[PDB]
Structure formats: structure tokens, C-alpha cells
Symmetry: C3
């Protein structure tokens, strides 16, 4: 498969306009932004519309749509950004321009010449992870390991560092620096998170830290080592404890120039490479007992959810429970056992927000057993489920996946989410779809009835972001196949 | 099925005169007290005998038979209530002049919507407990849980409190009927091991539910649910401040009944799913299924250390008996079988509740090795007796060795019940009732028409149903253990 | 089968001349010392060569070859001795003579009279739960408490002069012929490796048993039983006070032999079933069976860190080898295989006892990956040898690494002697010293002995090609 850099300019624009590359959220399948991005693209190419930004016009206006995922802790959240589709296609068309994309593709090819390092996180155009398989394999060659991570790589990048990538001291770097400035209030504070476009930018400076670390490396003559990397997750292998310490002090020096540093918690020099190549949550998943009883397995999942809270391994181990739900036929003692399993899975979600897709699928399929067709009694248990889970402060990701099950059981009866009310407009077949408080067009010059803004408003209000053809083909309950792609 | 309060007087006395109703001991299946208790009922019915006790006639006499079960470790005392006094005390309760107003008090417990009980006696017929499955389902509604027990509930029930579940003010009712007759058989406590004594506990526990509901409605605390099983309390609320105020009212209403809370088992939880199952139930789920017999039996032994004297070990041992009965041939009988006998002998040495299932696999393990050689098999069973005889109680052991030794040989006991069962098994004439139950309180000397016609009914009536004994297996079957 | 003392004089020599009896060291199947020693015997019986020892001539000369096994700890190693073949067949013929053999068998038979003491570690002619563990488990039916100990360093601390005290009292003795024949073959305790030493160790061990029962019958203590394996004691009784006076008597009789009990492994156990099995065996039952190859091999690595250099881990790598041999085609050789080669390489680089089985899974794994291309495989074996040569001693590595290397293509005196017999060239140089023989190499006596050592092959070429390319589970299950 082709990575982002060994493909052509026309292929890079077509790749960046995919709903996959636009935003990598745990979103239902019926949401698809490809047609909207590909319509506003060809409209700029056909000169039907014109996108022309200005730092003065853009300063002081919030542009994007931010969705909050709890990630971990439940007192902290991650700000995933839905970039304005108008500014996104324009910003994709500008870096995919052959004048600068030629420089970008060859800058990545220079990272491949850095032969000591291995970046397994470069985006690609579509067992165990390669980051782990590459670490277990090099134990045959090296005995020691240095694992580390970056505190907030995406939120702490000094945006002016992009200029330091292509040129040194004092170019596509200034182009990148200037346009993350146009969004996010011209603060140079951070870069957005939740897009392949933003990931491709991160790997440019990640590979540049890789370039500059090798430059300090060769000056001190330490060339018998290897590095396996995935985003900010660094793993340096060598057979000399003295070398790793020097490489660590050089890696903290190069990060000191880009305004970053190592996570003191997740930074350690290791002697058992095989032990520390896997996460502790993935190790305990191996030892979990295989159960045939549903309640025995589901209760075992909850206990696993305490030792490893808000972990994606809990979703994998919950997804396999959902695999066995569709395989079973009759659920004996539905009046007693099903009610008990509902309270179990409701508590797993009340403490682990990452399990909203699977947990809603668990709550949906178990209710198709207790109430076959009586959707009225089904809706009361979801409202009971929502009343509990809504006690958390930021529950927008719940409302989106709660809507997937809601839309297939009853469309006639207020989600309070700008995206969810937009989906509901396209689900209820409304005349014009809402765009207010979803994406701000105030940066575009003119009035709402101006020949340009009203023409762009026609695209935002008529283009469907929901594949109603796929939605009608989707099953009544959430299937494991819809969640299996989230890994 | 129907509850104990959903029965009329004609079938309430029928339920109370069942062997399961009379005692709840882990007695073998060839001792059914149904024929004795139902025939002495007819004697009072057709005026053959007269049974009317008096506080002065009965004060100072140990009327009932007592069997000690260690429970954990500290040993409980289950009471085999005197059959004469039992049927008199059940007929007076099932009298329609009082049974109509005892079940009426049970019906008022049903109107208490916030409280949910599952420990009411149920007229039975010929996985996951409801106490846990109900609490697991309540995590959808509530988030906090308050779980306590009543410390020594049965041994410390104030006897005069039975009058308080009907009328509050006391001066010079079914409460006095129960308060007066319980003090006659005992002399402060309540006997254990009978479902009649459980129905009395549910009335005083149900009144606690009613009185707590009156105290919680005056304080305007409405959003909570209670799941109760006898002593075990579980209160569910979404408010940590409401939950520890209902607690302060529970200790007040239990403080007026001479009761208290087990402070060692009193806790306010947050994970309802976590503390809905006991620790023994959780670790039982995690256990690896071993195909090897010695590997599994050794794993069961290690479980008994981390969970001393628990019914989960009996359930985990009963699965090993099901595996033994499935086997038809075992190999390496020399070193492997002898090592397994030593493993189970150590389990019973520290887990007294494993006496039935421990003797079960021991007799089944011996038949796999020594075969039909009754001499070598019986001598090894006596070697097991000598080891376990060091423990203080072991009265239940003699009850269950009697079931094992009788099916392979005949002729000890050293127990009034064991010698009586042995007399009924060997088919003698006069069954020994001399030291089993004290009938001295029956006014009149021997040979008199009342005591002699009662002695004729205590000696000639068979409590050991021999047709069932002749239909069982030589070794203890897993089905027998499953009934307990 | 029959024990070592239940064999007559003629077969006792045939037993001591067997390769699995000459050495218990885990060696490849193509090594067979049965041909060399048994042909040296027939040379002594035919008077073609006469081995005459002298305490003055043998003094100041290392007569034997030694191979180091790490055992455990990795900073400590145990010296396994391949006794000199000439001195071995001589010293084997000396005690197996009917005059001195009848006295030894009459002594081992006296150990049978000690009904309270049962030994399951006497050497026996060949053909789950070990008997030391199964017997200790069944005794829980009779007794309640247990007292398990181990002599601190039994073999290396035996006073060689104590072999007389097992046949005489204080001060022509049969045990005296052993005190002088061990102090001659080594610069003056008992060596390690040969079953001849196991029989000598069991002599005084049975005498510790006889002398202990004298002190316990004197103190009117009799209601107890003892299960023993070599120096591993397990004393059972129903009286904790009796057990402390039995142990206090065991340290006395052991102190009379200059022997010590390990303080670290000494405890009066309240629970027999709990401590009847080693901890590594108890955790082996707790391990979850895995259908995935990598999930199993990673679980093996985790087990080796809680029980380092354990023979229980060897059994559990052997299960992995049996599963590899069953699989016809491998699943995803590009990524999954290269990782498993690193897992086993890290296990062998910290658990030296896993050198044989580990080399086996290394080779079988490369056959699934690189296939029949031996050039691409040899570069990985060199990568494995480099990672493991960082260990200090190795040697045992090189022995089991020849078995894989020499089977596909052609450091120590032993591994080059095997190399000589695989090229049909046989230099006995620097392997067994012969300088304790009168005359030079030109003299007929020494020249005739060099001929028998050089002509007889210690490697059976008919078995080498008969063996498989990779080390099979049937080879590692013997050890």
C-alpha cells in the first residue's frame, strides 16, 4: 500500500478529501463527509466558489467544531477538531499544489534515508501491532531499551517549528505555519488533533527530530543502535547502557529546541525488552479466562475494566462479547439475567467513556432479547441508560452513538448537539439542513445574501453528510463489524 | 410457587410438617421426619393424645435435640425441635383465628414497595442467586450501595419483640402466642434450623422494613430501593447523603429490637457490580478447568486456603465428585490415588462443611483403588475418622460416615440420632428414644394412658425410610450433595 | 526395575560402563561413551593394557575434564566432571569386584531395614508427579506436620575420609578404598556428574539415616516417617515438639560428617499439601493454555522471570516445541516469526538450562521462515550465538549448538573432539590427561592407550544421520 508521500498530487487531494482522512473519530458509518469535501473542492476548481482567507478577517472567530473524547481519567478530555470543510479543502489544495507537494514528498523520502529509525505511524491510503512486533524482533540483536513519550506533542508544538524543518535557522514551512495560524485564533499555541492532514504534519517534524537527533548522534559517534517509533512513542535499542543515556540527553536537547520534552512518567531505561514491548493492559488480556457463560464473561469484563480503566483493550474484550451475542439464539432467564447484564454494561460505560459504541451495542442487542418488538419498553431502558450516563460533564460522543440505536427503533421523538441535530435533519428528511453554530462562515466576506456567501450556503445546506442509502441498509442493532474497524 | 403466607390453614400445617420444614440440616436422604410428624398430628386431631404444655411444667428441661455445625472455622447450634412440641406449636400457629392475622401482617409487607425481600419460605415441589441478580440489575437505576448484616440475629432476637409487630403499647395477639411458647421450649433467642423459626424471623424483619419505611417517609426520603435477604441488607440510592441517613435510621429501629449491625460487615460501597458477588464467587469463576484429577483436586485444595470453610468449596468439590462418577477407570492407582486421599483428608481437616462431599469422594476414590475389598476400604475410612476425630465437633461426620459405612457393611455411632438411625437401619423392635427427645414434661408417669400411647408412637414410628436407603448407591452421589 | 545394589557383580560393571551412567550431563544423542569405556574394560580384562595408579604419580595433575552448568543465579555455576575414562573403568572394576561389592550391597540392603526412612533417589537400571512428591502427599492422611530441609552443599562438602565411618567405627575397610581413590583422581570432596558418585553419596546418605534412627530410638521417639530424595529431607509426624528434637538430632549426625543444613531452606511446615510441591510446579498448573503460538511463547517468557533457570520452564518450552512440530504451515512469517526468534533468544540469554530446547525452537522457527536456505539461517544462528556468547561460561551452549550447526554444515576440547569424529580425521589433545602413566609417548604402554582412545569414536556417526535435522521434542524429553 502507498503511504502519503510516495503518491502523486492528484492522489493526495483525493486521499485528503476522504471521510477517513478528514477526521478519525469513533463515528457511525452513516456519517460521510466525502461528497461534501469533493463538492466544495471541484467548485473551487471550476471557479464556482472562491475561498480567500485573511489573518485580519480570521482573527477573533471560532471556525471549527470541537468534539470532546474523555480519553482517560474522566476529569480530562481530548479536543478532537472538525475543521471547517471550506477551509479544509482549501488548505488541502494548497499543500497538495505541485510546487510545495514536490518538496513535501521528497522531505519524507529523506526520512527514509535516516536508516537507523523506523516510523510505523506514517499514514497509509487504504494480531499484534507492528510497533510491538518490531520491538520483540530486535531483542535478538540488542539487550537494552529506552522507552519514552512526549507530554502533549500535538498541543505543544510551537507552530513556527515547521519553518525549521524545510530550512534551517532563518518554503513549505512558513506555508504550514501560517495556515494553522489562520484557524485556532492566530495564537501559534498548538495544532489541531483528529485528522490525517494534521498527522501528516506531525510526522514531518517527528521525522525532523529524527533527523536532528541523528546529527547529534554522529557527532558523538554512536552508530550501533536502532529506533522504533510511532508518533511520540519512542523506543531506542542499543547494547550499551552508556550510549542510551547519551542518546536520551541528546533527544531531550533536540526537543528543547521545538518546545517539547519527554513525559517523565512514561520514560524509563529497560533491561527486559520482551517484557516492556507490550502494554500492561494487553498483557492481562492474554491471561483472561475464556468463558462460555455470558454473565460470567461480562462480569469478567467489568473486573478487567477496573484494573485497566478507559482502555481500548477493554473495547476489544467487550467487542468479542458482542461477537458472541449475535451468535446466540435464546437467552434463558431473560427476566432476571438480562436485567443483571444491563446493569453491568451500564456501569462499564459510566466509568469508561471509550466503550460507548460497544456498550450501546451490548445494551441494544440484550434489549432485542428481553423485548423482541416492543420498542416502547426498549426506549424506556435506553432513556434509563441515558439518565445515568448523562451525569458526566462532557457526553457528546455518547449522544452520537446513542443516536445510531435511537434512529433505527423510533424516529418520532432534541439532542442538543450541533452535529446530532444536523444528522437528524438529514434523517428526518428536512427541506434545508442546519449549519448554524456548526461551522462559522463569518470569515467569508459579504452578507448572508451576498452572491458568494449565499452560494456557499447552498452547498452547506443542500449537500447530505449522511449516507441514507447505507443507513437504510444498516442493521437494527449495532453490529460488531461496525466497531471492529475502530480496533 | 406459592409463598408461605399464600397458604390456607389446611395446607399451612401440611407445609410445616414436612421434613425440609422440620430441619434444614445437611442430613442424608434416608431420614425423612415426614411420617413421624404427620402421624403425631393425627393423634392430636382424633383426640388420641393430649399435648398442652405449661410454663411451670416445662421450666428447667432441655426439650430439644441439638446438632452443632461449625459454620466457619466458633460453631453454630442447629436445633432438632422436639416433635411433640413442634406439632403442637404449628397447630396453634396454623389456627385460622391467628393464621388469618399472621398472613395479613405478611401481606402488609407486600405493600411496602421500596423494600424487596426474597427470603420468604416457599412451598417447593417434589447458578446466580436472586439476591445478587436483583442487586446487579439496580446499577442501572442507582449508583451507591449500603450493605450490612445483623450480628447474631437469631441468637439475639428479643423474644418479647414478637408482640411489637402487631401492637406497640404493651401492658397487662399472635405475638404473645409466639413469645410465650418459644420461651417454653428453650428455658432471649430463637431456635435455628427450621422454616417455622424462619417465618418468625421474616415477621420481625418485615416489621423492621415497615418501621424503617415510617421513619424514612417522615424525613421525606423516597428515592431508594432495598434488597434484603434475612440478615443481609442492601440499600441503593443515587445520594450518598440519603444512603447514610437511612443507615442511621436502620440502627435506631434495630436498636429498639435489641439488635445491632455487624460493624465488620457494615460498608458504604460505590461499585455495585463489584460488591454484588462474594469474593468466593469471584475467584471460583477464575479457576482453571483441569482435565487431570490430581491437578484439579490439588487446585480445589488451594482454593480452600484462600476461602476458609465456604459453600463455594463444597460446590467446587461437588464438581470433582461429578468428574469422579464420570470416570470408569483410573491409572497409576498406586502413587496417584493414595496422594489424592491425602489431599481431601487435609481439606476436611480444616473445612468442616466439606464433610458430606469429602466423605463422598473419599468413598468413591477408595472404590477406584481397592475395589470391592470391603476390609481394606473400611479400614482406610477408619483412618480418615481418626484424623478428623481430632476436631472438636464432628457430629455431622458421624451422621455421614453412617451413610457411607452402612451401604458397605454393618457394625459405635456415639450419638442419640446416630444410634436411632442405626436401630431403624438394622431393623430392630424398640427404637431407642431414651436420650433423643425429653418427654418428661408430659404430665404423668409411664404406663399411664397419655405417656404410654405417646411412647408407643415414638418407638414404633420409623423415621428412616428404608425403601429410599435400599435404592441409593453405595457411594455418595453428587445429586445428594446438590440438594443442600 | 532393579536397583543398583540388586544387580550382581558382572552386571554392576556393565551398568557403570553405560554412557547414561558414566555421565548424567544433558548431551546430544550422538554422544555415546559406552563404546570407549567398555572397550577399555575388555583391554584390562585381556591384559592388553594395565592401568596402575599411584598417589605420588597422580598428585599435582588434573586428570578429569569439567563442563560448567549454570544451574541458577547466573553468577554461580556447578562443575560437572567427566571423570577420566582410564581411571573410571579401573575404579569401577575395583568396587565391583566380588570381594568389595558383596560388602557394599550388604550395606545398601541394611538401609532397607530402616522401615521409617524411604529413599526414592537410589540409582536404578533403566530400560506429572514425582515419587518424592506423591509419597509426601499421601502421608497427609496419617501425619499432620512436615519438616523439609536440604544439605547446604552435600557433594562438594563431603569429607572423603568419612567413607570409613560408614563401614567401621572411629578407627582393610571397603570405604577406605573409596577415600583413597577419590583423593587420587583429584587434587585433595566427591565430584559431580557420574552415577558412581550418586551411589557413593547414597552410601553415606543411608548412613545418616542409620545413625539418625539410633538417636531417635534412644530418645523414645518412633511415631514418625521420613521421605528422602538425595539430600532433600521430608520428616513427617503428628508432634511439633518431636519434630524439633528429630531435627536437632539430624544436625548432630550431620555435624559429625562435617555437613550443614541450609538455614534458608529450613522450616517446620504446618501444612503438608501446601509445601509438597515446588512453587514453579504449582504455578505451571495456573498457566492458561494458548492456541496461539506467540501468545504461548510470550507466556513462557513471563514464567521464566518468576522462576529463573527452572527445569519447570524447560518442560513448558518443550510443549511449545511439540506444538511447532505439529503445525504444517506457519501463520504470517513476515512479522510474527521474527518476533518469536527474539523472545526465545532473550529466554536462553537469562535461563542457561533452556539452551537445548531453546536451540530447538530457534531452528524449527527458522525452518518455517527462511526455509531450506541455510545461508539465510546461519546468519541468524550467528546472531543467536553472539547474543548468548555474552554469557561468561557458555560451553554447554557450544555443545548443543554443534548439534544444530553440524547437522547442516561443517572453542572447547570436547566440541572439537566431536568435530574430529564428524570429519573422519581423533585428537584426544587436552581432553583427558595421561601423564600419570610411566614412560613417554614412545613407550609401548602409553602408545597402546593412545591407540584405543584415538581409534574408538565417542560420536556414533550411524546415529548422527539417523537423527533429525532439528532437535525434536523426543530428544529434550529425555532430560
Amino acid at each position: 500500500m502507498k503511504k502519503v508521500y510516495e503518491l502523486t498530487s492528484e492522489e493526495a487531494l483525493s486521499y485528503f478529501l476522504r471521510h477517513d482522512s478528514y477526521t478519525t473519530l469513533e463515528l457511525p458509518a452513516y456519517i460521510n463527509f466525502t461528497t461534501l469535501l469533493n463538492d466544495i473542492n471541484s467548485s473551487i476548481h471550476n471557479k464556482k466558489i472562491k475561498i480567500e482567507p485573511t489573518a485580519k478577517e480570521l482573527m477573533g472567530k471560532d471556525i471549527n467544531y470541537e468534539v470532546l473524547v474523555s480519553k482517560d481519567g474522566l476529569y480530562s478530555w481530548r479536543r478532537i477538531t472538525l475543521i471547517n470543510p471550506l477551509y479544509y479543502v482549501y488548505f488541502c489544495r494548497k499543500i497538495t499544489a505541485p510546487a510545495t507537494w514536490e518538496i513535501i514528498t521528497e522531505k519524507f523520502k529523506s526520512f527514509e534515508s535516516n536508516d537507523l529509525f523506523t516510523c510505523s505511524s506514517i499514514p497509509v491510503r487504504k494480531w499484534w501491532e507492528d510497533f510491538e512486533q518490531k520491538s520483540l524482533a530486535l531483542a535478538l540483536e540488542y539487550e537494552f531499551m529506552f522507552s519514552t513519550d512526549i507530554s502533549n506533542f500535538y498541543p505543544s508544538i510551537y507552530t513556527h517549528s515547521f519553518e525549521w524543518v524545510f530550512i534551517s535557522k532563518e518554503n513549505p514551512g512558513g506555508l504550514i505555519d501560517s495556515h494553522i495560524q489562520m484557524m485556532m485564533n492566530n495564537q501559534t499555541n498548538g495544532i489541531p488533533l483528529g485528522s490525517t492532514l494534521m498527522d501528516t504534519f506531525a510526522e514531518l517534524i517527528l521525522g525532523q527530530i529524527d533527523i536532528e537527533l541523528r546529527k547529534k548522534t554522529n557527532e558523538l559517534k554512536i552508530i550501533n543502535y536502532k529506533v522504533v517509533r510511532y508518533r511520540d512513542d519512542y523506543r531506542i535499542f542499543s547494547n550499551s547502557k552508556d550510549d542510551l543515556d547519551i542518546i536520551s540527553k541528546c533527544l531531550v536537547n533536540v526537543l528543547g529546541d521545538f518546545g517539547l520534552d519527554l513525559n517523565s512518567k512514561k520514560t524509563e531505561l529497560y533491561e527486559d525488552i520482551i517484557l516492556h514491548s507490550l502494554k500492561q493492559a494487553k498483557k492481562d488480556y492474554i491471561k483472561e479466562k475464556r468463558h462460555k457463560s455470558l454473565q460470567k464473561m461480562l462480569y469478567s469484563i467489568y473486573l478487567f475494566s477496573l484494573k485497566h480503566p478507559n482502555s481500548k483493550t477493554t473495547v476489544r474484550y467487550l467487542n468479542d462479547f458482542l461477537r458472541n451475542l449475535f451468535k446466540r439464539k435464546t437467552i434463558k432467564d431473560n427476566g432476571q439475567q438480562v436485567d443483571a447484564m444491563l446493569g453491568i454494561i451500564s456501569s462499564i460505560m459510566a466509568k469508561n467513556p471509550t466503550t460507548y459504541p460497544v456498550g450501546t451495542a451490548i445494551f441494544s442487542k440484550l434489549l432485542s432479547f428481553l423485548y423482541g418488538d416492543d420498542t416502547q419498553k426498549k426506549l424506556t431502558k435506553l432513556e434509563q441508560l441515558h439518565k445515568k450516563l448523562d451525569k458526566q460533564p462532557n457526553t457528546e460522543m455518547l449522544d452520537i452513538w446513542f443516536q445510531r440505536t435511537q434512529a433505527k427503533i423510533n424516529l418520532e421523538w432534541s439532542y442538543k448537539s450541533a452535529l446530532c441535530v444536523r444528522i437528524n435533519d438529514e434523517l428526518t428528511k428536512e427541506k434545508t439542513f442546519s449549519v448554524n453554530n456548526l461551522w462559522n462562515i463569518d470569515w467569508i466576506q459579504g452578507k448572508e445574501t451576498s452572491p458568494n456567501k449565499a452560494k456557499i450556503l447552498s452547498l452547506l445546506r443542500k449537500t447530505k453528510i449522511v449516507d441514507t442509502d447505507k443507513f437504510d441498509k444498516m442493521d437494527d442493532n449495532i453490529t460488531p463489524e461496525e466497531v471492529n474497524l475502530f480496533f
